[PDB]
Design a protein around this ligand. Structure first.
Ligand SMILES: [Ca+2]
Lengths: 58, 223
């Protein structure tokens, strides 16, 4: 099945500026991005630790 | 805000910033203890910052007051975005002055073509990322429900309206959510969502505050 950890980060259509983490497989690390507040995809974490636990090594 | 202008310090005295260690949303002060914002701006540990101009520097007119209650509309739908409204109670009453002032709720809905003022500290680029220090402002008209529905087929509910310019270049953007759309001195809208920002044929979508006036008044009074 497609690995959600490999999907690009998704801001979505809402207009907040909320800092979330995503796993960046090209770089091999959890990175920050801007989430707009709604319609999150799964490569979207509230902390670096949550991102590493779910996606580390993908 | 894309395509706008520098408001000028404290010229929009009802505009607040919601802070969770950094600015993430706007809001509008409606009395000394209550702010209106978007439901998708819900976070625990919100601090409301009043009297701001430069969001990154302490300048002299600020009041920083924690939220004591953050009440999302009970029918907010996080998939359709219907009922995208939240009320925030301040843990202590703001001190009202020329730089910190409330905005009136509407007595009736506004019509297509009514010119409004939209404001916030969100991104100023339609492609790319630049966040301002000081508050930005944009004049924009309410658009017809028919044009809004044509722009966003199947997505516009009775509690949403579009505002802006179909040619592109002028819109609200990430970091403006929750903030005001004010038309002839009344809070008619809350920054909510859109397809990107400032794109041709894709105006911003706003929560239609006039549909919530009784709920806002009764909820504030019950809390
Ligand atoms: Ca400041």
């Amino acid at each position: 099945r497609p690995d959600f950890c490999l999907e690009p980060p998704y801001t979505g259509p809402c207009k907040a500026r909320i800092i979330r983490y995503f796993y960046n497989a090209k770089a091999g690390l959890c990175q920050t991005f801007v989430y707009g507040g709604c319609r999150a995809k799964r490569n979207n974490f509230k902390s670096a630790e949550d991102c590493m636990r779910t996606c580390g090594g993908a | 805000i894309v395509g706008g202008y520098t408001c000028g310090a404290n010229t929009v005295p009802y505009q607040v910033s919601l802070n969770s260690g950094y600015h993430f949303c706007g809001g509008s002060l409606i009395n000394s203890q209550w702010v209106v914002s978007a439901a998708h701006c819900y976070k625990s540990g919100i601090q409301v910052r009043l009297g701001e101009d430069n969001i990154n520097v302490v300048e002299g007119n600020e009041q920083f007051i924690s939220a004591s209650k953050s009440i999302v509309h009970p029918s907010y739908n996080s998939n359709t975005l219907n009922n995208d409204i939240m009320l925030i109670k301040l843990k202590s009453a703001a001190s009202l002055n020329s730089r910190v002032a409330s905005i009136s709720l509407p007595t009736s809905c506004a019509s297509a073509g009514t010119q409004c003022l939209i404001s916030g500290w969100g991104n100023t680029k339609s492609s790319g990322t630049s966040y301002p220090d000081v508050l930005k402002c944009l004049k924009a008209p309410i658009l017809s429900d028919s044009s809004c529905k044509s722009a966003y087929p199947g997505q516009i509910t009775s509690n949403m309206f579009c505002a802006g310019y179909l040619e592109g270049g002028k819109d609200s953007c990430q970091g403006d959510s929750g903030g005001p759309v004010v038309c002839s001195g009344k809070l008619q809208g809350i920054v909510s969502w859109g397809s990107g920002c400032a794109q041709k044929n894709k105006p911003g979508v706003y929560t239609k505050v006039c549909n919530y006036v009784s709920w806002i008044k009764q909820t504030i009074a019950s809390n």
